[PDB]
Amino acid sequence: GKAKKKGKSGAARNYMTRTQAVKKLQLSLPDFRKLCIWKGIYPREPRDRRKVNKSATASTTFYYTKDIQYLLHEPLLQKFREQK
Amino acid sequence: PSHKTFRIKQKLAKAQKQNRPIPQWIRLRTGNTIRYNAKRRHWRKTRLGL
Amino acid sequence: MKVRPTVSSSRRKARKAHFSAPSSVRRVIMSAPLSKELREKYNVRSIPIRKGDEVQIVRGAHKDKEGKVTSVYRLKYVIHVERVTREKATGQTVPIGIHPSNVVITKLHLDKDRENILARIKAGREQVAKAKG
Amino acid sequence: LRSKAERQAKLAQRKMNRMARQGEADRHIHASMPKHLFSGKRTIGKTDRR
Amino acid sequence: NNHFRKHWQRRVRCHFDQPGKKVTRRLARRAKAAALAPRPVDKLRPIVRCPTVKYNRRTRLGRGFTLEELKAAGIPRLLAPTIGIAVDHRRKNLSEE
Amino acid sequence: KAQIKQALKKLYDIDTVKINTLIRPDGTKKAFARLTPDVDALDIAATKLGLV
Amino acid sequence: SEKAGHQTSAESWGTGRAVARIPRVSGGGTHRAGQGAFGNMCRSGRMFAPTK
Amino acid sequence: TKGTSSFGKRHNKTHGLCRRCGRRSLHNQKKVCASCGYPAAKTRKYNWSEKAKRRKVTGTGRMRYLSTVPRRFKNGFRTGVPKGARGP
Amino acid sequence: NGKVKAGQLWSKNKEELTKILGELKTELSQLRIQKISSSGAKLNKIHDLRKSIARVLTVINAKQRAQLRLFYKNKKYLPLDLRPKLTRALRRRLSKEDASRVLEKTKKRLTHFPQRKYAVKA
RNA sequence: GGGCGAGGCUCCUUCUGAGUUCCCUGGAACGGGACGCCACAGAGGGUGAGAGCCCCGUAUAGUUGGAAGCCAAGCCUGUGU
RNA sequence: GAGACCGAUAGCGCACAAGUAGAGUGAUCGAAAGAUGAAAAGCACUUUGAAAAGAGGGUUAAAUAGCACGUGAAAUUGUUG
RNA sequence: GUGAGCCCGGGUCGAACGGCCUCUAGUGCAGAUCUUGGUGGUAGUAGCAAAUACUUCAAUGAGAACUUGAAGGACCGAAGUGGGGAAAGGUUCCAUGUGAACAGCGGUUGGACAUGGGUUAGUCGAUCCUAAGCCAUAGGGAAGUUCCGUUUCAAAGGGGCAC
RNA sequence: AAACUUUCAACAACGGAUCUCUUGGUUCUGGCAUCGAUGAAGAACGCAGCGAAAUGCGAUAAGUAAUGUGAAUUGCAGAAUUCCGUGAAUCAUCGAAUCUUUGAACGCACAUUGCGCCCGCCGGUAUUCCGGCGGGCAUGCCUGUUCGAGCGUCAU
Numbered sequence A: 001g002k003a004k005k006k007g008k009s010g011a012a013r014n015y016m017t018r019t020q021a022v023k024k025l026q027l028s029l030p031d032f033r034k035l036c037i038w039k040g041i042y043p044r045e046p047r048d049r050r051k052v053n054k055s056a057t058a059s060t061t062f063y064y065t066k067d068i069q070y071l072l073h074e075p076l077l078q079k080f081r082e083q084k
Numbered sequence B: 001p002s003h004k005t006f007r008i009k010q011k012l013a014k015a016q017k018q019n020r021p022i023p024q025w026i027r028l029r030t031g032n033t034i035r036y037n038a039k040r041r042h043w044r045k046t047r048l049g050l
Numbered sequence C: 001m002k003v004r005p006t007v008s009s010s011r012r013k014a015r016k017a018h019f020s021a022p023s024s025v026r027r028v029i030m031s032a033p034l035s036k037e038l039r040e041k042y043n044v045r046s047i048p049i050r051k052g053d054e055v056q057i058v059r060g061a062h063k064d065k066e067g068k069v070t071s072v073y074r075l076k077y078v079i080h081v082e083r084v085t086r087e088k089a090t091g092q093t094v095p096i097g098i099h100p101s102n103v104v105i106t107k108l109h110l111d112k113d114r115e116n117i118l119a120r121i122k123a124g125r126e127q128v129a130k131a132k133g
Numbered sequence D: 001l002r003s004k005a006e007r008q009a010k011l012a013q014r015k016m017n018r019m020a021r022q023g024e025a026d027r028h029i030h031a032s033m034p035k036h037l038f039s040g041k042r043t044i045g046k047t048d049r050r
Numbered sequence E: 001n002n003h004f005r006k007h008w009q010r011r012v013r014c015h016f017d018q019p020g021k022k023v024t025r026r027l028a029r030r031a032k033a034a035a036l037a038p039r040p041v042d043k044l045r046p047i048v049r050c051p052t053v054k055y056n057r058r059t060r061l062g063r064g065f066t067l068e069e070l071k072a073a074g075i076p077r078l079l080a081p082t083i084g085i086a087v088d089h090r091r092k093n094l095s096e097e
Numbered sequence F: 001k002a003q004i005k006q007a008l009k010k011l012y013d014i015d016t017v018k019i020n021t022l023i024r025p026d027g028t029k030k031a032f033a034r035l036t037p038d039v040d041a042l043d044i045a046a047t048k049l050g051l052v
Numbered sequence G: 001s002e003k004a005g006h007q008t009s010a011e012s013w014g015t016g017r018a019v020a021r022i023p024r025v026s027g028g029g030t031h032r033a034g035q036g037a038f039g040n041m042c043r044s045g046r047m048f049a050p051t052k
Numbered sequence H: 001t002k003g004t005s006s007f008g009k010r011h012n013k014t015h016g017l018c019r020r021c022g023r024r025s026l027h028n029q030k031k032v033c034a035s036c037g038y039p040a041a042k043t044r045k046y047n048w049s050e051k052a053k054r055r056k057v058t059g060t061g062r063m064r065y066l067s068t069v070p071r072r073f074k075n076g077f078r079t080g081v082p083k084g085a086r087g088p
Numbered sequence I: 001n002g003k004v005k006a007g008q009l010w011s012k013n014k015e016e017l018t019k020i021l022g023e024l025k026t027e028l029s030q031l032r033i034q035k036i037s038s039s040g041a042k043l044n045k046i047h048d049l050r051k052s053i054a055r056v057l058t059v060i061n062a063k064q065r066a067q068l069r070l071f072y073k074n075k076k077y078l079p080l081d082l083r084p085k086l087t088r089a090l091r092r093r094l095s096k097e098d099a100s101r102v103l104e105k106t107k108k109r110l111t112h113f114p115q116r117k118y119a120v121k122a
Numbered sequence J: 001g002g003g004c005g006a007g008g009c010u011c012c013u014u015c016u017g018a019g020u021u022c023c024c025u026g027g028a029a030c031g032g033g034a035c036g037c038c039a040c041a042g043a044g045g046g047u048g049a050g051a052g053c054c055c056c057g058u059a060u061a062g063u064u065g066g067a068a069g070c071c072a073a074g075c076c077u078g079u080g081u
Numbered sequence K: 001g002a003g004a005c006c007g008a009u010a011g012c013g014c015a016c017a018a019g020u021a022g023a024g025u026g027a028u029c030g031a032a033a034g035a036u037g038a039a040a041a042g043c044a045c046u047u048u049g050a051a052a053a054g055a056g057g058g059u060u061a062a063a064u065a066g067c068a069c070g071u072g073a074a075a076u077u078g079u080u081g
Numbered sequence L: 001g002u003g004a005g006c007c008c009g010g011g012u013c014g015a016a017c018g019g020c021c022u023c024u025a026g027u028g029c030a031g032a033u034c035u036u037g038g039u040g041g042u043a044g045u046a047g048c049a050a051a052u053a054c055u056u057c058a059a060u061g062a063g064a065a066c067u068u069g070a071a072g073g074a075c076c077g078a079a080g081u082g083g084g085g086a087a088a089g090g091u092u093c094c095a096u097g098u099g100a101a102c103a104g105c106g107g108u109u110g111g112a113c114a115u116g117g118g119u120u121a122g123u124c125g126a127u128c129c130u131a132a133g134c135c136a137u138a139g140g141g142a143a144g145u146u147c148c149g150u151u152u153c154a155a156a157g158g159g160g161c162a163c
Numbered sequence M: 001a002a003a004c005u006u007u008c009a010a011c012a013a014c015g016g017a018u019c020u021c022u023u024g025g026u027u028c029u030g031g032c033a034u035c036g037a038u039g040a041a042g043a044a045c046g047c048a049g050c051g052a053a054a055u056g057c058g059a060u061a062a063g064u065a066a067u068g069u070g071a072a073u074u075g076c077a078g079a080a081u082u083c084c085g086u087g088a089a090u091c092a093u094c095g096a097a098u099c100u101u102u103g104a105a106c107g108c109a110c111a112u113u114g115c116g117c118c119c120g121c122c123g124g125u126a127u128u129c130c131g132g133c134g135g136g137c138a139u140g141c142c143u144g145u146u147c148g149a150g151c152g153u154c155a156u
């Protein structure tokens, strides 16, 4: 049918960077790192990091999109907001 | 035309299914007044107005 | 003379209600008197007729004929009685329409609903007679 | 009963067959007294027909 | 002198419902009496003299008793409408009779 | 087409290689489901469909 | 009813050579078109001096 | 030539079907229905045509919810089940 | 066969009701094909299967809505479909307590001077 | 200030009198004649032709069963911060 | 619930699958049309016709009621005198 | 009976109706180029004559100038009487069958009537883009139905990094 | 003399008047207050063993549950009803439900069954691909929560 567009499927959907994960979860960096350590969200590596982000370097940290989706439902986010 | 929309084709399908004479068992019912299809449509007589 | 404001003596409304009554009202309308010995047995004058009753026809050209009620055709207010029939041109047998007010019930098809009907009609008749006595 | 139903269906068509309709879908009502033919006057200027 | 130069037929009022309205008013009065039993259906009214020189020869029932009248009779103004006495505060007593 | 092939797989244990669809002039949808060469459509029609 | 015989749109066809000057129902495609209206002598019209 | 020969050029459509009232009165260029006034929120009606008002007045259609309101009012908008009725 | 009565359905719980619904739908699926292939005394069975499917769905819905009402018996906010319908104006109408609220001065005056029961000698 | 409350009213529900007696006409009596009966019911309708008594109903007191409200004769208690 | 109203050209446009059929680009316009018989008992069977039908012969109380159907005027027409 | 009218006989027909005194009215027709419906003479009359044209045998059938097959004769003459599409139509397409009606004759034939069948896409179009133009939003008018406004006097959002 | 035209009569035609009827209008009187974002009125599309319409209904589709009645429905077909019964019915009542696409109509649109986004669940070899299902995403305004902006006023 309709022709697909480039970069809308595959590793681009599969991975996101740490900056995108932090902006998606709307957390600070210490809270994001704390939640990742507590929930066991581990760094990942795409086969080609340019297919995920064109500005990625060797020090760029990648995570699973489904892992960030799972982190979106953690009740500790509201605990963080209540403490703030 | 051959080019037609889905809504137009659906309404034409309803008109095609409605285009029939009445069943013959209808006239044998008790107290019937229906003798024929008085809303029967033909493609040359009366337009559908779509 | 009627007194109640919810009662209408309108002929038009009466005929409309009679000829457009539903099946449960047509059952009450299609009532027949009981026989004499049934009347002293049950203290009931009239009952709605049903399939399986035994009737004697007392009006029309088929007077004094007896038979079982084979059908209760409520759609044109007719009962079909066994052997009270006629022949078509072809000689095939077709039942003859009889109105239930032209027959008298000589034997009742008795089930527990009919027993409850007869018992409550008899009890009502007795308590009305006792109250008015 | 089939023959009786066919006979009733055929006798249902007598009025429209006398009216000479092409089936039961022919329900066209024509103008027997048209306004353009039964109103107005013809002057010495422009006329409505030749 | 016939004032029929407007669209008079649009606001012609007949009174075929006059006996029905009498029946309705009587039913309402009976219901009010049954609700108010054993109290009377109406309140006590004072006797007052009609204004103007045409009608000052006749007395009639007024709206309610004055505050000075209730004070002289010994009935408090909060008790008075609760025992069927109509009270009017606008009317004054300009004379002793 | 995906709904039709999944419904056929769930109902009759039928695997199809492709499905074509049209909408008839009466308004109902007609679907031609071509089966895999391993299974025989005549045996499917005789046994499960009963179209003899 | 006060609106009996007046729930139609009809106008006379004018002075001419064929028909009378009664108001005639406009439109087409039905038996009512061209037929008289609004008169006590007309079929489907208002009576003379309607009862009040 | 303003009559019969001019009538042979009539093969376009000023109006199409309206999604709201179902009539062939939706102007194809103005995108405004001449009958019901779509897409304005109010339905087009005027007091100079009693016939046009009563052709689409309430009760001419199905009354799919409004017809059951008087029964619920007559029973008092009651809620629940008859006592001892079979069920959950 | 094909007629499932509600008296038996009101005693089951959810899983065998789902099993019965699946079996009835399967029977209706094969017998629609049997309808397009042959006929006879058979169409009464598919009518009975349709009505039985309707009955099973009704029983499942009624039991699960009753469970939801039991769950939401003691909560402030209910789902909109479980809230009473009435009319829109009836739902927007003031409550009985709010309509019967009076001021404190009115309460004092009604406490000390209510409408009395009285009679007048003739 | 609280709490009972006999009893009453409103709305649906079970139930209600007496000829299909004899003769004639008629395809069919619901017509004519004779003899009765009921009537707080001789309003209306149906039934093969004008039926109080064939059927539904109609009049009147009530009489079965059920729910939700309102009114209400009276009777228990607290007493003044 | 009723009427000193109208009784199918009347009475609402509509007593009928009527705001339907139908017309108009559209706003809108907008009809005609009720009655066999108590009961289909709606003509078996024979015969002549390609058929429609016709004639016998039944059905009905009546077909001088044959799903053109209660009654069946006049204009107009056919035969007979 | 002066009269408007009233009454009876005969035939037909099938369910109600009349006399007298009062009361009441949508109460009396030859006309209105009325209104609706129905029917005549004209009258078996005017016509049914543009687009060159038909003929033979057999079959089918109750019936064949206008059905079919074959046999002949012709016409369109590639800006077609051909092969295909856009708009418009909506099943008219195909098979089988067919009483009446319609095909201004005839009909066995039919775009008619009756029952069935038939339209298969990643690649052809729609779907996407914008044109002339139209409509939301901000905001400003208008008693208001709503009018202007389409980049504005708008806080109108994207990316990266972080022990 | 016939034919033809005209007159009169009988019968037969044509036509639908008259008479009788009336599940309908029209007018008056009495009672009641109850539409809608918990998605109305209206529109479209579907639903029966055999229906085109009317009627009823919504993929639970001439219908489900519940209560009552108590033996039908009927044009045909086919089944009934343990009749001493959780029970026929195109039955009545009606408090529980179902209620397709739309429409004030609400993700953006709509002359398209066009295009999206967010969050779950399931299936197909599947961390990436494909498919299905479920729950959501309009505007204005109010109360509150939270995140903010501005030397606008201050304290420090």
Ligand SMILES: [Zn+2]
Binding pocket: H018, H019, H020, H021, H022, H023, H025, H026, H033, H034, H035, H036, H037, H038
């Ligand atoms: Zn519209």
